């Protein structure tokens, strides 16, 4: 038992296909890896990021750029986390407070 996951739940992800938000299953490993997917299922991945490595900035609130929040939210509920590789990964957490739940949890697994 050298692994474990930090935390776990439904974030919108803009989604730089369909051009739009959609709803994505987040986990955040213990190691710094963050995984996402269709569903709570964990069966259809998305994509990931390794936090400790890739991540180079996260932006939360009004930090972010280029990205429009879900129609009838404020750039409050969201965080963008911009990686090596020249992409940024936009979320939108339901409010303020689970944005910045995330926001120092996503933080801290960059030192893992």
């Known amino acids: 038992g050298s692994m474990a996951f930090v935390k776990s739940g439904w ?10 938000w959609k ?7 213990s190691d710094g890896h963050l995984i ?6 964990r069966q259809n991945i998305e994509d ?9 900035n996260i932006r939360t609130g009004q930090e972010c750029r280029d990205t429009q929040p879900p129609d009838g939210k404020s750039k409050d509920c969201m965080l963008q ?3 090596r590789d ?7 957490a339901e409010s303020t407070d689970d944005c910045l739940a995330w926001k120092f949890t996503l933080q801290d697994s960059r030192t893992n």
């Open 11 to 20: 974030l919108l992800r803009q989604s730089t296909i369909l051009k739009r």
């Open 23 to 29: 709803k994505n299953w987040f986990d955040l490993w």
């Open 36 to 41: 996402y997917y269709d569903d709570q299922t």
């Open 81 to 83: 986390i911009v990686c």
């Open 48 to 56: 990931k990021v390794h936090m400790p490595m890739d991540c180079i």
């Open 86 to 92: 020249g992409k940024t990964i936009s979320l939108c």
